[PDB]
Design goal:
The structure is cut from a larger assembly and holds two copies of chain A.
Chain A (H helix, E strand, L loop, with lengths): L3 H16 L8 E8 L14 E5 L4 E6 L2 E10 L24 E2 H11 L10 E4 L5 E6 L3 H14 L7 E11 L1 H7 L1 E2 L5 E8 L4 E4 L2 E10 L11 E9 L1 E2 L7 H14 L7 H12 L6 H5 L17 H4 L1 H12 L5 E7 L1 H4 L5 H4 L7 E7 L10 H6 L2 E2 L16 E5 L10 H11 E12 L4 H8 L5 H6 L3 H10 L3 E7 L4 E7 L8 E4 L7 H10 L7 E5 L7 H8 L8 E6 L16 H9 L3 E4 L4 E8 L6 E4 L2 E5 L8 E5 L15 E2 L2 E4 L1 H8 L21 E5 L5 E5 L8 E2 L15 H4 L3 H15 L6 E5 L4 H13 L2 E6 L2 H10 L8 E3 L5 H8 L7 E4 L3 H8 L6 E5 L3 H5 L12 E5 L4 H4 L2 H17 L7 E5 L3 H10 L5 E5 L17 E4 L9 E5 L4 H12 L5 E4 L7 H12 L14 H14 L2 E6 L14 H25 ...
Bound molecules: NADPH dihydro-nicotinamide-adenine-dinucleotide phosphate (2 copies).
PDB class: biosynthetic protein
Keywords: Megasynthase, Lipogenesis, biosynthetic protein
Entry title: Composite structure of human FASN with NADPH in State 7
């Protein structure tokens, strides 16, 4: 974006050219600078700006392609005064803090906020913690200098979000005094002191003086945001049986099918084929007639859910990942056979997209060129190649040796099992993989296909018994590594080509002194040796050897590594024996697989799967409507509310159930995106819904009430003070009551309190059909005033004439046009109206000011003109007139004593019949989106309410608890509990603490060895403390069990321990050759031993703990060169967390790719990280991951 | 001077203009001041 200071610079240069002076000899003054739009600078091309001056009016104007961008006043400063730049009296005379923000910390904060500056705009050398002083750089540039002054002004703001300048009241510049003020430091660089005074709203830095800066909130909505890949790390058994049992569609389809099979009906293709086969003849069917039928010629058999069952299931992903892992290289060569009918090519490449580094060379091979002649574009969109290999024929050399072979023989026809597999293995590289997806003969579906498909023996030969397949694999000397078997008969074989038998090297890795590192470091150095090294951990179930081998395989000599692990989560389960003469060791050695993890009587290895996209939901009695995606009304959905940790018993709290809630214009503006969340007065959390202003329901005691909230009035429970409550009379229905509070309160405050309306006056109430208009009309008629009302349409006129009979035919005007001025002035005799309640736009507002009589009063309840700061001629004030700006929201922020007056007025109106409920259009809570859309349409007369709960005939109900509702789950924390963030002063720790405080923690223990050592840490800690958050710093090392116990005891004093987050990382990078056992011990001291001690202490004396998080890294599991120890520590943490969850205790371990703001994957922004952390915290799995692909 | 005094107002402030120069010349008055609840008065004693 083009800086505003750039506009100032270009206007200044144009003025200098016009006057004939230079830019360093022309002190200038800018007045009433207004920016109407931000011009985007394209990467290619140029944008032309036009600057025009009006010397007589001292007005300038900048325009882009005829659209005004900047307007204001400018003129040479006749007599500059150096006194104007003397640094103002500091807001805080004695900060008394040696610590200060350096450049890096300042711009880290500005990045977290949303500002992304480059070196040419990084001019703040240092600034005070409060942000009211600092030093700026001088690079002979003015745009940068003034933009840096704006940056200093923005830094001290307590308002989260992106704010851009929109108005400046006065800017004074004096090049001479600027040169005088500059002073050079020890380096040749020149600097200028800057002082920011928020009380006086002035920023002075050298020779510039900004007075009256105004910044408006920007949408902060960047298109094409990051889309992190989310995964779950879980143990997949090598052998799985009954894969698709849980799913119901497959079972019902099988019921339909095999029922037809009995004695020789749906949209699925296979059942339709069976029905067609049975239709022609019940007995003596012709093989040909059943083989061929319309709608079956297409290769839609693979599209049958049964024939595609295992492929859709995560089993295919498990086998593909296993094949990927056991690869000496970092590239894949996958060649498919019978691709035309198999159709795997549409699936396998998609599953392997996540692997950031893996690059594959897919090839589709089929017997005939015309076969697979269709869907060519589908192949082209992927990186796949054609092939002309017949399975019976020996494989062409062009395919050559391939690491993976995929068949999908279930649909495609193999000429002969033995010969086809012989050709395959001949084509298969040494130490390769074969993937086969067949149907076991003798199972029901196998029988069904056998009775059918008997016309073509080639396909018939494909269907074989499982024992036959297993025996055949032995004949072709191909070894089996896994099998994925469905509950109906579908099986997915995976076989590995044996490698020349070699003597293995065994090395125990269970030493707790990490002395094995030297032992292995010696072995791997002998790169001449090709024997494989088999690390085995059998002593402990929390070894990190998995991450070790993952990271080592990237390092040189990695192809020789193999892991063995015995981690049984159950003590009862017997631990096997891996003695060389024992079966298991030899069988796994024959397996020749890197990851050999034994867990609860099943060999297997850990695998990744993509977690379900659907957001979790739980039943709750406290949920609030929120717009998940800003500005998209289709994203409105119920979300769990923080009121779950609130109590109705407290008097000031008085947690009130919500039966009906109503919607106002502000809600539609907020949800649709026009109005900003920061524009609502008050201290609002960054993540929170601000929808709703009134409601009705049963107070904790069951008594019916209608209330008034600053926000969050649209939910199943509201936390409200008793001062903003009324009582619904016995004559009113709750549906009606919800329309009264806001409209009548604002009408009374505007007329009675501010305008002091008296009997017999004349009023011009705009938009009578609206709620505020109707309330104002009702109030005016009670006193006896003549009222002119403007209504947009005709049916509104009919409704208002029927509802208020006193109104006469001459009491109505047109609001969509500016012609109400002539109506009022004609029917008033030209005198005017004594009071105006206006909520219209600019031109309408100006037309309304001309309707006021002498001693008039103009009530303004709109916001567009005020926000835009449109001018108002003061000649209207020559006749005595008062211009009120009526904002009812000021009452919630302060002025309760003032609020009691409006409360009494509304109560009197209710008690005297003046207050009358408006017409309502009830939309059920499940259709809140429908209500928002209906009110956005603009045809509603009255109020549009939401029925969040149906009313009961009883006058008082003892239990008014909300009925349970299913809504999105969000993470909130009780106020009285304490949370420990080990290593909480680090880059991620501070942001995690900031996120938690927004969820209401109020008691925090941040652990760090050195302590508060940087200005940013002190700034954040002080900010948290001022907010009422009891922050604390411990310096209790969690590696020592005594330290962990002392840390927990220290946290217990503030309150019961709620959750512990472990983010303490000490990293010593280096390849295995450099690594030494001391480095391993150092790296694993905080993460492995720390997690162990925290788990022990928490299981001991933390009964109420509900969060046990541990931040792992993608280097573990995924792998990374030169970080073996880091992966080992992370893997150990993951093992501990998995052990915890199996025993019912909470536990989690998140694997992050790379954090950006504070291995082939881009760094992830903090906000996305926090969203993902919430999602993971709400999910039921033990280990989860998150990263962004390049 | 008149513009400067307006900036001195607080929320719920009242501005009593008795001078008749800016009013007669019809000078502009930015309405952004009214976001802070502010009452602007044109006070002429001659009306009585
Ligand atoms: N003190 C304060 O600061 C408060 C401010 N207000 C403001 O006062 C005004 C009155 O609110 P209320 O009467 O309840 O509003 P409603 O939406 O209930 O009624 C709107 C009325 O104005 C017209 N109107 C307003 N917005 C639109 C739109 N987007 N499209 C079409 N017509 C529209 C309607 O048509 P038509 O005029 O053509 O008949 C109708 O008469 C609002 O601007 C509200 O925000 C309200 C309460 C507190
Ligand atoms: N790219 C990334 O950012 C990724 C990081 N992670 C995880 O993120 C977490 C947080 O890293 P981040 O904060 O960004 O980086 P830091 O380097 O700041 O993390 C270390 C923090 O913990 C403190 N610490 C170090 N040793 C101890 C100890 N023994 N006891 C208590 N506190 C200690 C450090 O302060 P001090 O030195 O004074 O003790 C520092 O504040 C780590 O647990 C790491 O595993 C993993 C995935 C990706």
């Amino acid at each position: 974006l083009f800086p505003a200071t750039g506009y100032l610079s270009i206007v200044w240069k144009t003025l200098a050219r016009a006057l004939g002076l230079g830019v360093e000899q022309l002190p200038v003054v800018f007045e009433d600078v207004v920016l109407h739009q931000a011009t985007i600078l394209p990467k290619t091309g140029t944008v032309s700006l036009e600057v025009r001056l009006l010397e007589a009016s001292r007005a300038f104007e900048v325009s882009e392609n005829g659209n005004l961008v900047v307007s204001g006043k400018v003129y040479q400063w006749d007599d500059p005064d150096p006194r104007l730049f003397d640094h103002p009296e500091s807001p805080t005379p004695n900060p008394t803090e040696p610590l200060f923000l350096a450049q890096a910390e300042v711009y880290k904060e500005l990045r977290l906020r949303g500002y992304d500056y480059g070196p040419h705009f990084q001019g703040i050398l240092e600034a005070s913690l409060e942000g009211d002083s600092g030093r700026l750089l001088w690079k002979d540039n003015w745009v940068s200098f003034m933009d840096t002054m704006l940056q200093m002004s923005i830094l001290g703001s307590a308002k989260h979000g992106l704010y851009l300048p929109t108005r400046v009241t006065a800017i004074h510049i004096d090049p001479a005094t600027h040169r005088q003020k500059l002073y050079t430091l020890q380096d040749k660089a020149q600097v200028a002191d800057v002082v920011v005074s928020r009380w006086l709203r002035v920023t002075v830095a050298g020779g510039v003086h900004i007075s009256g800066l105004h910044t408006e909130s920007a949408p902060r909505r960047q298109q094409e945001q990051q889309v992190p890949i989310l995964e779950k790390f879980c143990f997949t058994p090598h052998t799985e049986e009954g894969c698709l049992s849980e799913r119901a569609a497959l079972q019902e389809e099988l019921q339909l099918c095999k029922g037809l099979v009995q004695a020789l009906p749906s949209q699925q293709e296979l059942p339709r084929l069976l029905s067609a086969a049975c239709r022609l003849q019940l007995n003596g069917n012709l093989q040909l007639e059943l083989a061929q039928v319309l709608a079956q010629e297409r290769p839609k058999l693979p599209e049958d859910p049964l024939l595609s069952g295992l492929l859709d299931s995560p089993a295919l992903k498990a086998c593909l990942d296993t094949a990927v892992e056991n690869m000496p290289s970092l590239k894949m060569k996958v060649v498919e056979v019978l691709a035309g009918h198999g159709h795997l090519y549409s699936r396998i490449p998609g599953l392997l997209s996540p692997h950031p580094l893996l690059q594959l060379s897919y090839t589709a091979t089929d017997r005939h060129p015309q076969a697979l002649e269709a869907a060519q574009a589908e192949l082209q969109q992927h990186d796949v190649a054609q092939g002309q290999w017949d399975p019976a024929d020996p494989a062409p050399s062009a395919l050559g040796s391939a690491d993976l072979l995929v068949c999908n023989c279930a649909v495609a026809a193999l000429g002969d099992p033995a010969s086809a597999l012989s050709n395959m293995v001949a084509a298969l590289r040494e130490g390769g993989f074969l993937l086969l997806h067949t149907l076991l003969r003798g199972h029901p579906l196998g029988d069904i296909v056998a009775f059918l498909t008997s016309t073509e023996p080639q396909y018939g030969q494909g269907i074989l018994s499982q024992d036959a397949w297993e025996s055949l694999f032995s004949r072709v000397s191909l070894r089996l590594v896994g099998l994925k078997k469905s509950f109906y008969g579908s099986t997915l074989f995976l076989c590995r080509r044996p490698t020349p038998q070699d003597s293995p090297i065994f090395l125990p890795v269970d030493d707790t002194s990490f002395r094995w590192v030297e032992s292995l470091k010696g072995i791997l150095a002998d790169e001449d040796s090709s024997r494989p090294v088999w690390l085995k951990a059998i002593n402990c179930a929390t070894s990190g050897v998995v991450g070790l081998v993952n990271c080592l395989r990237r390092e040189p000599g990695g192809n020789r590594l193999r892991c063995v692990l015995l981690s049984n989560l159950s003590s009862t389960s017997h631990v096997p024996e891996v003695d060389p003469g024992s079966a298991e060791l030899q069988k796994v050695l024959q397996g020749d697989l890197v990851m050999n993890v034994y867990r609860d009587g099943a060999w297997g290895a850990f695998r990744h799967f993509l977690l379900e996209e659907d957001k979790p939901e739980e039943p709750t009695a406290h949920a609030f409507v929120s717009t998940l995606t800003r500005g998209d009304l289709s994203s409105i959905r119920w979300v769990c509310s923080s009121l779950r940790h609130a109590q109705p018993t407290c008097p000031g709290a008085q947690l009130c159930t919500v039966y009906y809630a109503s919607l106002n214009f502000r809600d539609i503006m907020l949800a649709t995106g026009k109005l900003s969340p920061d524009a609502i007065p008050g201290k609002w959390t960054s993540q929170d819904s601000l929808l709703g202003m009134e409601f009705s329901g049963r107070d904790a005691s069951g008594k019916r009430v209608m209330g008034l909230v600053p926000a969050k009035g649209l939910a199943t429970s509201v936390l409200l003070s008793p001062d903003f409550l009324w009582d619904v009379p016995s004559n009113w229905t709750l549906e009606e009551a919800a329309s009264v509070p806001v409209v009548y309160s604002t009408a009374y405050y505007a007329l009675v309190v501010r305008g002091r309306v008296r009997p017999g006056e004349t009023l011009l109430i705009h938009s009578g059909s609206g709620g505020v208009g109707q309330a104002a009309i009702a109030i005016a008629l009670s006193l006896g005033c003549r009222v002119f009302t403007t209504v947009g349409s005709a049916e509104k006129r009919a409704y208002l004439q029927a509802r208020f009979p006193q109104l006469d035919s001459t009491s109505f005007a047109n609001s969509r046009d500016t012609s109400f001025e002539q109506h009022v002035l004609w029917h008033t005799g030209g005198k005017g109206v004594d009071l105006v309640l206006n909520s219209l736009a600019e031109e309408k507002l100006q037309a309304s000011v001309r309707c006021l009589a002498t001693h008039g009063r103009f009530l303004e309840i709109g916001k567009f003109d005020l926000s835009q700061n449109h001018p108002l001629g003061m000649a209207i004030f020559l006749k005595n007139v008062t211009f009120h700006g009526v904002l009812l929201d000021a009452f919630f922020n302060e002025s309760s004593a003032d609020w009691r007056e409006v409360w009494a007025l509304v109560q009197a109106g209710i008690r005297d019949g003046v207050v009358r409920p408006l017409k309502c259009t009830v939309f059920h809570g499940a259709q809140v989106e429908d209500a928002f859309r209906y009110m956005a349409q603009g045809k509603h007369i009255g109020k549009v309410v939401v029925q969040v709960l149906a009313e009961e005939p009883e006058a008082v109900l003892k239990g008014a608890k909300p009925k349970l509702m299913s809504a999105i789950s969000k993470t909130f924390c009780p106020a009285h509990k304490s949370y420990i963030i080990a290593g909480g002063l680090g880059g991620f720790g501070l942001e995690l603490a900031q996120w938690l405080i927004q969820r209401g923690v109020q008691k925090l223990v941040l652990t760090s060895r050195s302590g508060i050592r940087t200005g940013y840490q002190a700034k954040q800690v002080r900010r948290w403390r001022r907010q009422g958050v009891q922050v604390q710093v411990s310096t209790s090392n969690i590696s020592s069990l005594e330290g962990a116990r002392g840390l927990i005891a220290e946290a217990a004093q503030l309150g019961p321990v709620g959750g512990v987050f472990n983010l303490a990382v000490v990293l010593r990078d280096g390849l295995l050759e450099n690594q030494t056992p001391e480095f391993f011990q150092d790296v694993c001291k905080p993460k492995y031993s720390g997690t162990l001690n925290l788990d022990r202490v928490t299981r001991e004396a933390c009964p109420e703990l509900d969060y046990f998080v541990v931040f792992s890294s993608v280097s573990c599991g995924r792998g990374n060169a030169g970080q073996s120890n880091y992966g080992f520590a992370n893997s150990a943490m993951e093992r501990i967390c998995e052990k915890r969850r199996h025993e019912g205790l909470p536990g989690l371990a998140v694997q992050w790719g790379a954090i950006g703001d504070v291995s082939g994957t881009l760094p992830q922004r903090m906000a996305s990280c926090l969203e993902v952390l919430d999602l993971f915290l709400n999910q039921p799995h033990m280990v989860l991951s998150s990263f962004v692909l390049a």
